[PDB]
Amino acid sequence: EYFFSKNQIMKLNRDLQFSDLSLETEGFSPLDLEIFTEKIFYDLQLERDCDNVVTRELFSKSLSAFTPSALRGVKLTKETNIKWGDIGALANAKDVLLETLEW
Amino acid sequence: FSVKGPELLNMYIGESEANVRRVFQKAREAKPCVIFFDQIDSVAPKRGNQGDSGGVMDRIVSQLLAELDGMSTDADGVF
Amino acid sequence: DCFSKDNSHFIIDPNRTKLITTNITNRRPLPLSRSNLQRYYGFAETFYYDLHIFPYVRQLVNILETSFNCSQRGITLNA
């Protein structure tokens, strides 16, 4: 709420409240946020040529395509794209994995 | 690409594990490539036998099992 | 001079013109979309990308043109 006010005169539309967005940005450190706000402002400005300063969908359209400033290293294997519906069997092991790691 | 028998094996502790990875990396650079492990015996002996010493032959074969197949593999043209 | 009645267009004569210069001015270049200077002067032409096809160049051009257009918005958004 500070950042969006300080950087440029602009606001989040009435469609959403800042608490949701706070929920959306798990683990984002303050410099990362300074980067992220600028990213969103750029995406709004010309990547969409609309004459407006409000956003609801751009976050979902760009947050995923973002790397948290401190979060790079050994690159996560997010490209394997294996769904647990592809594994099928191994219930005895699936459930213990899901409860220990996922839940 | 020719793997001249036990070419990979090396003096030090970890440079064999660097040589294997370098070989696979360079091959992966040119997608339509072949790897010819000539006399695989010298490089991939049975893991964890009692009649063997040093253990590096186990580390190297494990590294093979890892990098050759592993996970996140794509652009399978590497025969 | 005595011909001050008009100043729209004039000739320069080496028998009367001398080389005098002031400090460095500034002005915008000519956008490629309007005039291909290299083409005219036979220079080593920069490759003419086509934004409709090449993905990545569009991102760069968009960023730079955004920073260009924000001049009249007048904020330090440059990245």
How buried is A33 (Cβ within 10 angstroms: 0-12 exposed, 13-18 middle, 19+ buried)? middle
Which residues from chain B sit within 8 angstroms of residue A77, using beta carbons? Answer: 71-72
On whether any CB of chain A is under 8 Å from the CB of C38, the answer is no
Neighbouring chains to B with at least 3 Cβ pairs closer than 8 Å: A
Is C45 in contact with C39 (CB distance < 8 Å)? yes
On whether any CB of chain B is under 8 Å from the CB of A86, the answer is no
On whether any CB of chain B is under 8 Å from the CB of A79, the answer is yes
H/E segment holding residue C57: helix C55-69
Interface-testing mutation among A3, A4, A8, A35, with chain C (most C C-beta atoms within 10 A): A8
> If you ran DSSP here, which 8-state letter would residue C54 be given?
-
DSSP string, B2-62: EE-STTS--SSSSHHHHHHHHHHHHHHHSSS---EETTGGGT-PPTT-TT--SSHHHHHHH
Would the CB atoms of A77 and B72 count as touching at under 8 Å? yes
Q: Which of A7, A38, A46 sits opposite C62 (nearest CB)?
A: A46
Q: How far is CA C43 from CA A23, C29, C40, in A?
A: 55, 17, 8
Tokens at residue B38, please?
A: 């000539």
Q: How far is CA B32 from CA A54, B7, B65, B77, in A?
A: 48, 22, 21, 5
- Quick one: closest CA in C to A43, which residue? C63
Q: How far is CA A43 from CA A17, A52, A84, C5, in A?
A: 20, 12, 34, 55
